[PDB]
Amino acid sequence: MRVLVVPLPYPTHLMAMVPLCWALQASGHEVLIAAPPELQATAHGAGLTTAGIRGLRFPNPAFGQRDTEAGRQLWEQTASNVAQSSLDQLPEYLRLAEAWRPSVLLVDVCALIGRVLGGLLDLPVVLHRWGVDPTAGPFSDRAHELLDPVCRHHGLTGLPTPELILDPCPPSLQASDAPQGAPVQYVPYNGSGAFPAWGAARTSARRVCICMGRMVLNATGPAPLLRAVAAATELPGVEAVIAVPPEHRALLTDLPDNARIAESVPLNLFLRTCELVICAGGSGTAFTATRLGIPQLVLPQYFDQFDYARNLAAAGAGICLPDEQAQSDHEQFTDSIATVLGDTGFAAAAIKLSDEITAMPHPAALVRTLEN
């Protein structure tokens, strides 16, 4: 196979596909990532090769509310944006496919250009979910409303149905309306970096990791990070491990002596020594914590994060702070950490979810499915 990968332009979406890209190359197939400038570093940082492509609102709980007027509008608008940019850049992807001649397209569920390109080239399309998938309804309807015409002009019935949907989300966390996909085990890929000497052993302190993310914090500003540091550092006996992009290190003005800043250290190298992960939900951070059986305190902000956070809380594996009212309330935030630290039930439920993940077939096992 010659697999052309068509991700959304968000590092976290491409990172979710990295172990599969490796599974393919290790099984003797060829892989190329169509990457806008925003994804180049992510792609190359994973050892992969690319074809260049030119390319107070938070928290917003309406993203987790597709039945409301605002929820439906946000997901329609997301579809409209990706549909418009798909048309704008279709000439570029058609040139690429002519140069490289993929036999199959591995396409993020939200990267609609990949479905168009599949239709127009008569290439099979394997969609890939990055995690919780809330695109049924508003997003998917709007994608068809906008792209069906375009495909019908090319002689198709409309935007085609994909060959297969790969799904790394444990079923217990998946949106109830996401159509059934093909399970694939989440393998944590959090980038390269070095094993911290401290990351090997537990401490007598209560180790609480805060891991927010470049893309979240650029959207939100520093509040979720700083409110998390204030909640974690207040409780007696806690050791905060603050996992940050290099540029966010300076927001950290005054930390207790035992706090650790972990700059560009892949979470998975140390997270088994932590009792709680405080995060915004849904990305590699959260799935690595769930893979490793670590409960989470989730402050959702946008997209699929409210869904992930609710679903995690419902499974008993963490707590959700659902909106600005909750996340701004230092008492609810600190009480939430104390709650998880004082009830081994959260870790038990997180272990159950870990078991859901590890019972799914690994990316190496999915390569045969792609073949077929």
Ligand X SMILES: OC[C@H]1O[C@H](O)[C@H](O)[C@@H](O)[C@@H]1O
Distance CA 48, CA 41 (A): 10
- Burial profile 137-171: b = 16 or more Cβ within 10 angstroms, e = fewer: bbbbebbbebbeebbeeeeeeebbebebbbbbbbe
40 binds ligand X (CB under 6 A): no
* Token code pair at residue 260: 């650790």
From residue 6 to residue 25, what is the string marking binding to a copy of itself with x (rule CB under 8 A)?
------------xxx-xx-x
Site for ligand X in 41-70 (CB under 6 A): 64-67
Q: CA-CA distance, 149 to 55, in Å (whole number)? A: 23
Which residues, numbered 238-297, are part of the site for Mg ion (CB under 5 A)? Answer: none
Residue 279 tokens, joined = 């995060």
Residues annotated in a binding site for dTDP? 12, 190, 213, 216, 265, 267, 284-285
Using the rule CB under 8 A, is 236 a contact of a copy of itself?
Answer: no
Query: How far from each other are the two terminal CA atoms of the chain, in whole angstroms?
Result: 11
Sequence-separated (6 or more) residues with CB below 8 Å from residue 207: 238, 239, 241, 273, 274, 275
The answer to whether residue 94 forms part of the interface with a copy of itself (CB under 8 A) is no
Q: Which residue has the tokens 């993020």?
A: 108
* In the complex, minimum distance from the CB of residue 134 to a copy of itself, in angstroms, rounded to a whole number: 28
Tell me the closest approach of the beta carbon of residue 252 to Mg ion, in angstroms: 39
Joined tokens for residue 64: 């987790």
Q: What is the DSSP letter of 66?
A: T
304-343 footprint of ligand X as x/- string (CB under 6 A): ---x------------------------------------
Nearer to ligand X, 224 or 300 (CB): 300
Which C-beta is closer to ligand X: that of 309 or that of 317? 309
Q: Which helix (H) or strand (E) holds 149?
A: helix 138-153
Interface ranges with a copy of itself (CB under 8 A) = 18-20, 22-23, 25-28, 32, 40, 43-52, 99-100, 185, 187, 189, 191-195, 197, 200-201, 266, 269, 358, 362-365, 367
Interface ranges with ligand X (CB under 6 A) = 64-67, 71, 134, 175-177, 307
